[PDB]
């Protein structure tokens with residue numbers, strides 16, 4: 705019954721960028737295909753005088769050859785017609801880091817405790833997502849109340865991504 709068209713997905717009513725600024729800890733994630741951040745992920749959002757939003761993020765990345773590395777990444781966001789939908793150009797501090805362009809949607813947030821993000825990097829012909837990713841972020845590393853977990857579990861259902869998210873460890877590897 706429930707529609708999986710990325711076009712139909714709901715997003716944050718009247719997104720407020722400055723209000724999202726600060727440190728966010730990823731608690732759980734739904735990885736995309738290929739190399740992705742492993743764990744110990746922490747994002748840090750900024751918004752300039754102009755309204756230009758930017759972010760930095762640390763995360764452990766396992767390189768093909770098995771070395772583990774603490775990837776220091778960079779992201780710049782571009783506004784769209786949808787205040788909660790942005791275009792994100794990212795790159796790493798080190799040259800060997802994945803560089804790219806991806807959609808960045810703020811599905812839901814309360815700005816103070818949690819946030820569900822999402823990106824489809826490929827649309828199937830039908831209109832659903834063939835390559836997605838999603839971050840569940842928390843204001844406090846400790847996580848959230850069974851109350852908010854309810855909400856999140858709900859946003860996840862709506863993104864056609866329930867029962868396929870994983871918990872993210874934080875063990876200070878990239879120093880925390």
Ligand SMILES: CC1=C(/C=C/C(C)=C/C=C/C(C)=C/C(=O)O)C(C)(C)CCC1
Nearest residue numbers: 739740759761765775778779794801802
């Ligand atoms: C920029 C950006 C994001 C994507 C980061 C990616 C995609 C990092 C990939 C790192 C790799 C791919 C490192 C490596 O493999 O060296 C996320 C949504 C958290 C949202 C805001 C900041």
